[PDB]
Design an enzyme around this catalytic site. Structure first.
Site, short mmCIF file in Angstrom:
data_model
loop_
_atom_site.label_atom_id
_atom_site.label_comp_id
_atom_site.label_asym_id
_atom_site.label_seq_id
_atom_site.Cartn_x
_atom_site.Cartn_y
_atom_site.Cartn_z
N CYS A 148 -2.07 4.98 10.14
CA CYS A 148 -0.85 4.14 10.44
C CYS A 148 -1.29 3.01 11.26
O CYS A 148 -2.19 2.93 12.12
CB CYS A 148 -0.31 5.00 11.40
SG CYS A 148 0.35 6.73 10.79
N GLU B 183 0.78 -1.18 -0.16
CA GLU B 183 0.08 0.07 -0.06
C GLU B 183 0.83 1.22 0.06
O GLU B 183 2.04 1.34 0.58
CB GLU B 183 -0.87 0.14 1.37
CG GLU B 183 -1.58 -1.16 1.61
CD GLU B 183 -2.76 -1.53 1.25
OE1 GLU B 183 -3.65 -2.27 1.90
OE2 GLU B 183 -3.17 -1.38 0.07
C1 5AD Z 1 4.19 4.56 11.80
C2 5AD Z 1 3.93 4.55 13.06
O1 5AD Z 1 2.64 3.89 13.32
C3 5AD Z 1 2.64 3.18 14.34
N1 5AD Z 1 1.47 2.06 14.47
C4 5AD Z 1 1.96 0.58 13.93
N2 5AD Z 1 0.23 -0.06 13.93
C5 5AD Z 1 -0.51 0.94 14.48
C6 5AD Z 1 -1.92 1.20 14.92
N3 5AD Z 1 -2.72 0.18 14.75
N4 5AD Z 1 -2.34 2.39 15.14
C7 5AD Z 1 -1.69 3.41 15.44
N5 5AD Z 1 -0.33 3.43 14.97
C8 5AD Z 1 0.48 2.19 14.73
C9 5AD Z 1 4.12 2.31 14.28
O2 5AD Z 1 4.77 1.15 15.11
C10 5AD Z 1 4.78 3.71 13.68
O3 5AD Z 1 5.64 4.16 14.57
#
Ligand code: 5AD
Ligand code: MET
Ligand code: SF4
Ligand code: MG
Ligand code: MG
Ligand code: MG
Length: 360
Positions: free
Chosen positions: A340, A90
RNA sequence: CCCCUUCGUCUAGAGGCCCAGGACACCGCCCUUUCACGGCGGUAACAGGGGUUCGAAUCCCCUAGGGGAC
Protein backbone atom coordinates in the site's frame (compact mmCIF):
# COMPACT_ATOMS: atom_id res chain seq x y z
CA UNK A 1 -16.28 4.69 -32.58
CA UNK A 2 -17.57 1.32 -31.35
CA UNK A 3 -19.14 1.40 -27.88
CA UNK A 4 -17.19 -0.47 -25.19
CA UNK A 5 -19.53 -2.57 -23.04
CA UNK A 6 -17.07 -2.43 -20.11
CA UNK A 7 -18.09 1.25 -19.66
CA UNK A 8 -21.75 0.35 -18.98
CA UNK A 9 -23.44 -0.83 -15.80
CA UNK A 10 -26.68 -2.88 -15.92
CA UNK A 11 -29.04 0.11 -16.30
CA UNK A 12 -27.02 1.75 -19.09
CA UNK A 13 -26.71 -1.59 -20.90
CA UNK A 14 -30.50 -2.14 -20.70
CA UNK A 15 -31.04 1.24 -22.38
CA UNK A 16 -28.31 0.32 -24.88
CA UNK A 17 -30.27 -2.81 -25.85
CA UNK A 18 -33.62 -0.96 -25.84
CA UNK A 19 -32.04 1.09 -28.62
CA UNK A 20 -31.44 -0.99 -31.77
CA UNK A 21 -34.67 -2.85 -30.83
CA UNK A 22 -33.84 -5.56 -28.28
CA UNK A 23 -35.28 -6.57 -24.92
CA UNK A 24 -33.77 -5.92 -21.41
CA UNK A 25 -32.77 -9.57 -20.79
CA UNK A 26 -30.03 -9.30 -23.46
CA UNK A 27 -28.10 -7.03 -21.09
CA UNK A 28 -28.25 -9.79 -18.46
CA UNK A 29 -27.07 -12.42 -20.94
CA UNK A 30 -24.09 -10.49 -22.30
CA UNK A 31 -22.89 -9.34 -18.86
CA UNK A 32 -22.87 -12.98 -17.72
CA UNK A 33 -20.63 -13.84 -20.67
CA UNK A 34 -18.39 -10.83 -20.06
CA UNK A 35 -18.05 -11.18 -16.28
CA UNK A 36 -18.89 -14.80 -15.32
CA UNK A 37 -16.75 -16.13 -18.19
CA UNK A 38 -14.28 -13.31 -19.02
CA UNK A 39 -15.54 -13.24 -22.61
CA UNK A 40 -14.43 -10.50 -25.03
CA UNK A 41 -15.70 -12.12 -28.25
CA UNK A 42 -19.35 -12.04 -29.36
CA UNK A 43 -18.90 -15.22 -31.45
CA UNK A 44 -18.67 -17.29 -28.24
CA UNK A 45 -22.03 -16.12 -26.80
CA UNK A 46 -24.29 -19.14 -27.46
CA UNK A 47 -27.24 -17.49 -25.62
CA UNK A 48 -27.79 -15.12 -28.57
CA UNK A 49 -28.94 -15.67 -32.18
CA UNK A 50 -26.28 -15.20 -34.89
CA UNK A 51 -28.14 -12.16 -36.28
CA UNK A 52 -27.85 -10.19 -33.01
CA UNK A 53 -24.22 -11.35 -32.53
CA UNK A 54 -23.13 -10.01 -35.93
CA UNK A 55 -25.08 -6.83 -35.09
CA UNK A 56 -23.10 -6.33 -31.84
CA UNK A 57 -19.76 -6.60 -33.70
CA UNK A 58 -20.92 -3.65 -35.84
CA UNK A 59 -21.75 -1.29 -32.98
CA UNK A 60 -19.88 -2.66 -29.93
CA UNK A 61 -16.74 -4.21 -28.45
CA UNK A 62 -15.41 -5.66 -25.18
CA UNK A 63 -12.03 -4.00 -24.64
CA UNK A 64 -10.18 -4.21 -21.33
CA UNK A 65 -6.84 -2.41 -20.96
CA UNK A 66 -3.73 -4.42 -21.85
CA UNK A 67 -1.51 -5.96 -19.19
CA UNK A 68 2.03 -4.83 -20.02
CA UNK A 69 3.88 -6.17 -16.96
CA UNK A 70 3.57 -8.80 -14.26
CA UNK A 71 5.56 -9.21 -11.04
CA UNK A 72 5.24 -11.92 -8.41
CA UNK A 73 6.12 -11.47 -4.75
CA UNK A 74 7.63 -14.16 -2.55
CA UNK A 75 4.47 -13.89 -0.38
CA UNK A 76 2.04 -14.63 -3.26
CA UNK A 77 1.13 -11.04 -4.21
CA UNK A 78 0.95 -10.20 -7.92
CA UNK A 79 1.21 -6.74 -9.48
CA UNK A 80 0.10 -5.99 -13.04
CA UNK A 81 0.79 -2.76 -14.90
CA UNK A 82 -2.08 -1.95 -17.25
CA UNK A 83 -1.65 0.23 -20.35
CA UNK A 84 -3.72 3.38 -20.26
CA UNK A 85 -2.92 5.38 -23.38
CA UNK A 86 0.78 6.28 -23.15
CA UNK A 87 0.60 5.89 -19.35
CA UNK A 88 0.23 3.06 -16.83
CA UNK A 89 -1.55 2.25 -13.57
CA UNK A 90 -1.17 -0.75 -11.27
CA UNK A 91 -3.44 -3.53 -10.06
CA UNK A 92 -2.51 -5.80 -7.14
CA UNK A 93 -3.82 -9.29 -6.36
CA UNK A 94 -3.53 -10.43 -2.73
CA UNK A 95 -4.08 -14.11 -1.93
CA UNK A 96 -4.97 -15.02 1.66
CA UNK A 97 -5.94 -18.41 3.15
CA UNK A 98 -9.73 -18.04 3.03
CA UNK A 99 -10.08 -15.20 0.49
CA UNK A 100 -8.41 -13.28 -2.33
CA UNK A 101 -8.39 -9.50 -2.72
CA UNK A 102 -7.76 -7.10 -5.64
CA UNK A 103 -6.54 -3.56 -5.06
CA UNK A 104 -7.75 -1.38 -7.94
CA UNK A 105 -6.56 2.04 -9.16
CA UNK A 106 -9.06 4.89 -9.70
CA UNK A 107 -6.89 7.65 -11.21
CA UNK A 108 -3.77 8.04 -13.32
CA UNK A 109 -1.67 9.12 -10.36
CA UNK A 110 -3.29 11.29 -7.69
CA UNK A 111 -3.64 15.01 -7.09
CA UNK A 112 -3.85 14.97 -3.25
CA UNK A 113 -0.11 15.18 -2.35
CA UNK A 114 -0.01 12.92 0.75
CA UNK A 115 3.67 13.08 1.83
CA UNK A 116 4.08 9.37 2.75
CA UNK A 117 2.65 7.99 -0.53
CA UNK A 118 4.65 7.09 -3.66
CA UNK A 119 1.62 7.69 -5.91
CA UNK A 120 1.62 11.37 -4.81
CA UNK A 121 5.26 11.75 -5.89
CA UNK A 122 4.16 10.88 -9.46
CA UNK A 123 1.61 13.72 -9.66
CA UNK A 124 -1.73 13.59 -11.51
CA UNK A 125 -2.80 13.17 -15.14
CA UNK A 126 -6.50 12.22 -15.25
CA UNK A 127 -9.35 10.04 -14.00
CA UNK A 128 -9.72 6.47 -15.30
CA UNK A 129 -12.78 5.52 -17.36
CA UNK A 130 -15.25 2.94 -16.08
CA UNK A 131 -13.78 0.41 -18.52
CA UNK A 132 -10.30 1.16 -17.18
CA UNK A 133 -11.45 0.51 -13.58
CA UNK A 134 -13.71 -2.55 -13.90
CA UNK A 135 -11.26 -3.74 -16.60
CA UNK A 136 -8.61 -4.21 -13.91
CA UNK A 137 -10.97 -6.65 -12.19
CA UNK A 138 -11.87 -8.31 -15.51
CA UNK A 139 -8.25 -8.66 -16.50
CA UNK A 140 -7.18 -9.97 -13.06
CA UNK A 141 -10.06 -12.47 -12.92
CA UNK A 142 -9.13 -13.85 -16.36
CA UNK A 143 -5.42 -14.21 -15.58
CA UNK A 144 -6.08 -15.77 -12.15
CA UNK A 145 -8.80 -18.08 -13.50
CA UNK A 146 -6.63 -19.50 -16.32
CA UNK A 147 -3.58 -20.53 -14.27
CA UNK A 148 -5.15 -22.82 -11.64
CA UNK A 149 -2.32 -22.31 -9.12
CA UNK A 150 -2.39 -23.80 -5.60
CA UNK A 151 -3.63 -21.26 -3.03
CA UNK A 152 -4.64 -18.80 -5.79
CA UNK A 153 -8.40 -18.29 -5.28
CA UNK A 154 -10.74 -16.24 -7.54
CA UNK A 155 -11.44 -12.66 -6.46
CA UNK A 156 -13.72 -12.49 -3.40
CA UNK A 157 -12.82 -8.98 -2.22
CA UNK A 158 -12.09 -5.67 -3.95
CA UNK A 159 -10.39 -2.69 -2.33
CA UNK A 160 -10.23 0.77 -3.90
CA UNK A 161 -6.69 1.23 -2.57
CA UNK A 162 -4.60 1.43 -5.74
CA UNK A 163 -3.52 4.68 -7.37
CA UNK A 164 -5.72 7.75 -6.83
CA UNK A 165 -8.50 9.18 -4.64
CA UNK A 166 -11.76 7.38 -5.57
CA UNK A 167 -14.05 10.21 -4.39
CA UNK A 168 -12.58 12.53 -7.04
CA UNK A 169 -13.81 10.13 -9.75
CA UNK A 170 -17.41 9.25 -8.80
CA UNK A 171 -18.61 9.31 -12.44
CA UNK A 172 -16.53 6.24 -13.16
CA UNK A 173 -15.86 4.69 -9.75
CA UNK A 174 -19.53 4.21 -8.85
CA UNK A 175 -20.58 2.42 -12.07
CA UNK A 176 -17.47 0.21 -11.83
CA UNK A 177 -18.40 -0.76 -8.29
CA UNK A 178 -22.01 -1.41 -9.36
CA UNK A 179 -20.65 -3.98 -11.84
CA UNK A 180 -18.53 -5.59 -9.10
CA UNK A 181 -21.65 -6.02 -6.94
CA UNK A 182 -24.07 -6.95 -9.75
CA UNK A 183 -25.17 -10.60 -9.84
CA UNK A 184 -24.69 -10.53 -13.63
CA UNK A 185 -21.31 -8.87 -13.11
CA UNK A 186 -18.79 -10.11 -10.54
CA UNK A 187 -21.45 -10.63 -7.84
CA UNK A 188 -19.23 -9.47 -4.98
CA UNK A 189 -20.59 -8.49 -1.57
CA UNK A 190 -21.22 -4.93 -0.39
CA UNK A 191 -19.19 -5.80 2.69
CA UNK A 192 -16.12 -6.99 0.76
CA UNK A 193 -15.94 -4.06 -1.64
CA UNK A 194 -14.17 -1.39 0.41
CA UNK A 195 -13.62 2.18 -0.76
CA UNK A 196 -10.75 3.99 0.96
CA UNK A 197 -10.71 7.81 1.08
CA UNK A 198 -8.64 10.68 2.46
CA UNK A 199 -11.78 12.76 3.03
CA UNK A 200 -13.37 14.73 0.21
CA UNK A 201 -16.42 15.27 2.41
CA UNK A 202 -18.91 16.73 -0.10
CA UNK A 203 -18.12 13.74 -2.34
CA UNK A 204 -18.58 11.29 0.54
CA UNK A 205 -22.10 12.70 0.97
CA UNK A 206 -22.69 12.23 -2.77
CA UNK A 207 -21.44 8.64 -2.49
CA UNK A 208 -24.12 7.94 0.14
CA UNK A 209 -26.86 8.95 -2.32
CA UNK A 210 -25.37 6.75 -5.10
CA UNK A 211 -24.19 3.41 -3.64
CA UNK A 212 -23.61 1.52 -0.36
CA UNK A 213 -20.14 -0.06 0.01
CA UNK A 214 -17.71 -0.84 2.83
CA UNK A 215 -15.73 2.25 3.84
CA UNK A 216 -12.20 2.76 5.11
CA UNK A 217 -10.83 6.21 5.99
CA UNK A 218 -7.24 7.39 5.68
CA UNK A 219 -7.01 9.13 9.06
CA UNK A 220 -3.26 8.69 9.78
CA UNK A 221 -3.17 11.20 12.68
CA UNK A 222 -4.62 11.86 16.15
CA UNK A 223 -5.06 15.62 15.60
CA UNK A 224 -5.35 18.34 12.93
CA UNK A 225 -1.82 19.76 13.23
CA UNK A 226 -0.09 16.47 12.44
CA UNK A 227 -2.68 15.62 9.77
CA UNK A 228 -2.34 19.02 8.06
CA UNK A 229 1.31 18.14 7.44
CA UNK A 230 1.03 14.58 6.11
CA UNK A 231 -2.44 14.57 4.48
CA UNK A 232 -2.79 18.14 3.12
CA UNK A 233 -6.51 17.85 2.25
CA UNK A 234 -7.14 17.98 6.04
CA UNK A 235 -6.63 21.76 5.63
CA UNK A 236 -9.82 21.99 3.53
CA UNK A 237 -11.78 19.36 5.50
CA UNK A 238 -10.55 18.85 9.07
CA UNK A 239 -10.86 15.70 11.18
CA UNK A 240 -14.25 16.52 12.79
CA UNK A 241 -15.83 17.57 9.47
CA UNK A 242 -14.62 14.20 8.08
CA UNK A 243 -15.70 12.07 11.05
CA UNK A 244 -19.16 13.68 10.83
CA UNK A 245 -19.48 12.84 7.13
CA UNK A 246 -18.41 9.27 7.99
CA UNK A 247 -21.14 8.95 10.64
CA UNK A 248 -23.65 10.17 8.05
CA UNK A 249 -22.49 7.43 5.65
CA UNK A 250 -22.69 4.77 8.37
CA UNK A 251 -26.31 5.66 9.22
CA UNK A 252 -27.49 4.59 5.73
CA UNK A 253 -25.15 1.61 5.42
CA UNK A 254 -25.75 -2.13 5.61
CA UNK A 255 -22.33 -2.71 4.00
CA UNK A 256 -20.42 -1.19 6.94
CA UNK A 257 -22.48 -2.96 9.64
CA UNK A 258 -22.16 0.07 11.94
CA UNK A 259 -18.33 0.32 11.72
CA UNK A 260 -15.95 2.36 9.57
CA UNK A 261 -12.36 1.12 9.21
CA UNK A 262 -9.76 3.61 10.41
CA UNK A 263 -6.58 3.46 8.34
CA UNK A 264 -3.52 4.65 10.23
CA UNK A 265 -0.03 4.58 8.74
CA UNK A 266 2.74 4.12 11.29
CA UNK A 267 5.43 6.74 10.71
CA UNK A 268 8.49 6.45 13.00
CA UNK A 269 8.48 9.20 15.68
CA UNK A 270 5.82 11.24 13.85
CA UNK A 271 2.39 9.83 14.75
CA UNK A 272 3.43 6.57 16.32
CA UNK A 273 4.06 7.33 20.03
CA UNK A 274 2.09 6.11 23.05
CA UNK A 275 1.04 9.75 23.57
CA UNK A 276 -0.55 9.69 20.10
CA UNK A 277 -2.48 6.46 20.71
CA UNK A 278 -4.12 7.97 23.83
CA UNK A 279 -5.10 11.05 21.82
CA UNK A 280 -6.40 8.85 18.96
CA UNK A 281 -8.52 6.80 21.38
CA UNK A 282 -10.09 10.02 22.70
CA UNK A 283 -10.61 11.29 19.14
CA UNK A 284 -12.51 8.17 18.00
CA UNK A 285 -14.70 7.68 21.12
CA UNK A 286 -17.87 8.89 19.32
CA UNK A 287 -17.20 7.10 15.99
CA UNK A 288 -17.94 3.35 15.92
CA UNK A 289 -15.00 1.77 14.15
CA UNK A 290 -12.25 -0.76 13.75
CA UNK A 291 -8.64 0.40 13.64
CA UNK A 292 -6.25 -0.82 10.93
CA UNK A 293 -2.60 0.09 11.64
CA UNK A 294 -0.42 0.18 8.50
CA UNK A 295 3.36 -0.18 8.82
CA UNK A 296 4.85 2.41 6.49
CA UNK A 297 6.09 1.05 3.16
CA UNK A 298 9.08 3.01 1.86
CA UNK A 299 9.60 4.66 -1.53
CA UNK A 300 12.55 6.53 -3.12
CA UNK A 301 13.43 9.83 -1.43
CA UNK A 302 10.75 9.64 1.29
CA UNK A 303 11.65 11.63 4.44
CA UNK A 304 10.09 9.00 6.77
CA UNK A 305 10.96 5.68 8.39
CA UNK A 306 8.83 2.66 9.25
CA UNK A 307 7.76 2.39 12.89
CA UNK A 308 9.60 -0.47 14.59
CA UNK A 309 7.55 -3.53 15.49
CA UNK A 310 7.85 -2.78 19.22
CA UNK A 311 6.60 0.81 18.79
CA UNK A 312 3.68 -0.47 16.68
CA UNK A 313 2.94 -3.20 19.23
CA UNK A 314 2.81 -0.75 22.16
CA UNK A 315 0.62 1.64 20.13
CA UNK A 316 -1.92 -1.12 19.48
CA UNK A 317 -1.80 -2.40 23.09
CA UNK A 318 -2.86 1.09 24.19
CA UNK A 319 -5.72 1.18 21.66
CA UNK A 320 -6.90 -2.30 22.74
CA UNK A 321 -7.03 -1.12 26.37
CA UNK A 322 -9.62 1.46 25.24
CA UNK A 323 -11.77 -1.37 23.76
CA UNK A 324 -10.96 -0.82 20.06
CA UNK A 325 -10.62 -3.68 17.60
CA UNK A 326 -7.07 -3.04 16.39
CA UNK A 327 -5.37 -4.91 13.54
CA UNK A 328 -1.91 -4.52 12.05
CA UNK A 329 -2.15 -4.73 8.25
CA UNK A 330 0.28 -7.42 7.14
CA UNK A 331 2.69 -6.03 4.53
CA UNK A 332 1.94 -7.71 1.19
CA UNK A 333 4.16 -7.51 -1.90
CA UNK A 334 6.72 -4.93 -0.74
CA UNK A 335 9.51 -6.84 -2.55
CA UNK A 336 7.90 -5.73 -5.86
CA UNK A 337 6.75 -2.25 -4.78
CA UNK A 338 3.16 -3.54 -4.53
CA UNK A 339 2.55 -2.72 -0.82
CA UNK A 340 0.00 0.00 0.00
CA UNK A 341 1.34 3.37 -1.07
CA UNK A 342 4.15 2.04 -3.34
CA UNK A 343 2.20 2.17 -6.61
CA UNK A 344 4.10 4.54 -8.90
CA UNK A 345 2.81 3.33 -12.29
CA UNK A 346 3.93 5.47 -15.23
CA UNK A 347 2.35 8.89 -15.05
CA UNK A 348 2.66 12.08 -17.06
CA UNK A 349 2.07 14.79 -14.47
CA UNK A 350 -0.16 17.62 -15.72
CA UNK A 351 0.01 19.66 -12.47
CA UNK A 352 3.60 20.89 -13.02
CA UNK A 353 4.58 19.42 -9.66
CA UNK A 354 8.24 19.06 -10.76
CA UNK A 355 8.63 22.66 -11.98
CA UNK A 356 6.84 23.86 -8.83
CA UNK A 357 9.23 21.85 -6.60
CA UNK A 358 12.39 23.57 -7.93
CA UNK A 359 10.76 27.02 -7.53
CA UNK A 360 10.04 26.15 -3.86
C1' C B 1 -39.41 -30.98 -36.62
C1' C B 2 -35.43 -31.19 -32.15
C1' C B 3 -33.16 -29.37 -27.47
C1' C B 4 -33.52 -25.73 -23.25
C1' U B 5 -36.35 -23.01 -18.47
C1' U B 6 -34.86 -25.29 -10.34
C1' C B 7 -33.97 -19.72 -4.71
C1' G B 8 -31.22 -13.00 -6.40
C1' U B 9 -26.87 -15.72 -9.33
C1' C B 10 -24.63 -20.49 -10.63
C1' U B 11 -25.95 -25.45 -9.70
C1' A B 12 -27.51 -30.88 -7.06
C1' G B 13 -31.58 -33.94 -9.41
C1' A B 14 -33.07 -39.65 -13.84
C1' G B 15 -41.20 -41.81 -10.21
C1' G B 16 -40.71 -42.36 -3.20
C1' C B 17 -33.29 -40.23 -1.24
C1' C B 18 -36.60 -33.71 -2.02
C1' C B 19 -43.01 -29.77 1.83
C1' A B 20 -36.21 -29.67 -2.99
C1' G B 21 -29.36 -29.99 -1.07
C1' G B 22 -24.97 -26.66 -1.75
C1' A B 23 -21.83 -22.25 -3.07
C1' C B 24 -21.80 -17.19 -3.56
C1' A B 25 -25.16 -12.86 -3.21
C1' C B 26 -29.07 -10.66 -0.05
C1' C B 27 -30.89 -9.78 4.93
C1' G B 28 -29.91 -10.12 10.39
C1' C B 29 -26.79 -10.45 14.84
C1' C B 30 -21.82 -9.79 16.70
C1' C B 31 -16.69 -7.38 15.99
C1' U B 32 -13.79 -5.85 23.92
C1' U B 33 -8.41 -8.77 19.83
C1' U B 34 -9.32 -13.92 12.97
C1' C B 35 -9.65 -7.59 8.88
C1' A B 36 -5.76 -4.98 1.90
C1' C B 37 -13.78 -5.56 6.25
C1' G B 38 -13.35 -10.36 10.23
C1' G B 39 -17.01 -14.29 12.82
C1' C B 40 -21.91 -16.72 13.10
C1' G B 41 -26.81 -17.28 11.71
C1' G B 42 -31.58 -16.57 8.79
C1' U B 43 -35.03 -15.73 4.42
C1' A B 44 -35.26 -17.61 -0.41
C1' A B 45 -36.68 -21.68 -6.28
C1' C B 46 -38.89 -26.44 -9.51
C1' A B 47 -41.26 -20.65 -16.03
C1' G B 48 -47.13 -20.93 -16.15
C1' G B 49 -51.53 -23.96 -16.76
C1' G B 50 -53.73 -28.89 -17.21
C1' G B 51 -53.31 -34.25 -17.51
C1' U B 52 -51.20 -39.44 -16.14
C1' U B 53 -49.95 -41.96 -11.27
C1' C B 54 -51.00 -44.29 -4.69
C1' G B 55 -47.06 -40.63 -5.47
C1' A B 56 -44.36 -35.68 -10.36
C1' A B 57 -38.76 -30.85 -10.51
C1' U B 58 -38.74 -35.80 -13.04
C1' C B 59 -43.55 -38.88 -17.59
C1' C B 60 -47.40 -36.66 -21.25
C1' C B 61 -50.22 -32.07 -23.56
C1' C B 62 -50.80 -26.96 -24.29
C1' U B 63 -49.06 -21.87 -23.55
C1' A B 64 -45.01 -18.08 -22.74
C1' G B 65 -39.73 -17.12 -23.40
C1' G B 66 -34.82 -18.69 -25.41
C1' G B 67 -31.49 -21.48 -28.60
C1' G B 68 -30.46 -25.14 -32.93
C1' A B 69 -31.00 -28.61 -37.79
C1' C B 70 -34.18 -28.11 -43.09
C1 5AD C 1 -4.77 2.29 1.09
C2 5AD C 1 -4.12 2.96 2.29
O1 5AD C 1 -2.69 2.98 2.16
C3 5AD C 1 -2.16 4.17 2.76
N1 5AD C 1 -0.80 4.52 2.30
C4 5AD C 1 -0.43 5.50 1.45
N2 5AD C 1 0.93 5.51 1.31
C5 5AD C 1 1.44 4.54 2.10
C6 5AD C 1 2.78 4.00 2.42
N3 5AD C 1 3.91 4.51 1.88
N4 5AD C 1 2.85 2.96 3.29
C7 5AD C 1 1.74 2.43 3.86
N5 5AD C 1 0.50 2.87 3.59
C8 5AD C 1 0.28 3.90 2.74
C9 5AD C 1 -3.27 5.17 2.46
O2 5AD C 1 -3.20 6.61 2.59
C10 5AD C 1 -4.58 4.42 2.44
O3 5AD C 1 -5.33 4.64 3.64
C1 MET D 1 -2.93 4.84 -2.10
S1 MET D 1 -4.32 5.60 -1.25
C2 MET D 1 -5.68 4.69 -2.00
C3 MET D 1 -7.03 5.02 -1.40
C4 MET D 1 -7.28 6.50 -1.13
N1 MET D 1 -6.66 7.35 -2.20
C5 MET D 1 -6.81 6.88 0.27
O1 MET D 1 -5.99 7.78 0.47
O2 MET D 1 -7.25 6.29 1.24
S1 SF4 E 1 -2.62 8.47 -0.37
FE1 SF4 E 1 -4.42 7.89 -1.36
S2 SF4 E 1 -4.84 9.97 -1.58
FE2 SF4 E 1 -3.13 10.53 -0.45
S3 SF4 E 1 -2.05 10.56 -2.31
FE3 SF4 E 1 -1.52 8.51 -2.19
S4 SF4 E 1 -3.32 8.09 -3.22
FE4 SF4 E 1 -3.79 10.14 -3.45
MG1 MG F 1 -32.67 -19.74 -12.49
MG1 MG G 1 -16.99 -6.70 7.38
MG1 MG H 1 -35.28 -23.69 0.98
Amino acid sequence: GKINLLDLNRQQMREFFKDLGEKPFRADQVMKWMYHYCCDNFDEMTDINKVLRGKLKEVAEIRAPEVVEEQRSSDGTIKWAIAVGDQRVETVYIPEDDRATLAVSSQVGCALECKFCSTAQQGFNRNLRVSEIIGQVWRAAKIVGAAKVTGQRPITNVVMMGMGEPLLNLNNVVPAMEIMLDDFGFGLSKRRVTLSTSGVVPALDKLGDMIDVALAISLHAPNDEIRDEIVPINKKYNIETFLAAVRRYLEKSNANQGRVTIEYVMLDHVNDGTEHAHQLAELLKDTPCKINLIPWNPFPGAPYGRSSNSRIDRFSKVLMSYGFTTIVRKTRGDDIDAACGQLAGDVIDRTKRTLRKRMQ
